[PDB]
Amino acid sequence: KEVSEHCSHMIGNGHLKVLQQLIDSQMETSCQIAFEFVDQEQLDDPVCYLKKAFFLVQDIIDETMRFKDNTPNANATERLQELSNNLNSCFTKDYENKACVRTFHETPLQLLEKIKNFFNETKNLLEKDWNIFTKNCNNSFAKC
Amino acid sequence: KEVSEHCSHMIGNGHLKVLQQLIDSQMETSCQIAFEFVDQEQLDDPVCYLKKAFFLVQDIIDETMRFKDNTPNANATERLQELSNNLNSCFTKDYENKACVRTFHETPLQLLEKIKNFFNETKNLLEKDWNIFTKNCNNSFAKCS
């Protein structure tokens, strides 16, 4: 059914810039961190891909993007943490729950890229059709 | 036997400021990197500790502190790298090389705290006696096992 129309403009360019500045400041290291994310090999559908990613992105924002309190980046994460909560109103639940997901071991920088790409693709789609993520993904998911 | 009196002010609060910022912008994680640094246990002499650290900090700044070009942190690291070179003339060379050196498996922020700590202390001892790092540390290094 219908969802909030606000979802159409939930994600602004201010959110993506804040996200890039955050990325830019990060130091390139060999150290890899472990995190759960969507396995593309088993889930291609662009809509259902982002639909499944949104919930993993949320966890990552809360439980991995840690910055020293009151720093410019910490504030970025504040804004992103809030944005993520508002977006709950734009993603309907699908019947499953741990399939389509794999363990990723990659650089913190390569991770912050995935989050970026998510908020970007998600932004575009929502502009085009702010009911897009009400899609039924039971099958797409089940094909994993 | 002596170094330019200007070693006194070669390190400025400006250098420490850009460094603290660089540090504050780094995402806290438990990802651990491996690097060589001074083993405090085998080398606790304040002066000689820093002399040994200097070259090690040189290496780290050059090969480990990597940022995307023209980035605020990439520009700070450039300044520090320059400072590192100009500081070389303030440290007299000692004779001995892997004495007092140990591998550390720690997070980047911890590794940076070592870099910041190095500059702070080094800055202080130069403000008190700009010839301090002329000291002969052959014996302190030799004590290491």
Ligand SMILES: [Ca+2]
């Ligand atoms: Ca797994």
Ligand SMILES: [Ca+2]
């Ligand atoms: Ca379906």
Ligand SMILES: [Ca+2]
């Ligand atoms: Ca004079």
Ligand SMILES: [Ca+2]
């Ligand atoms: Ca000066």
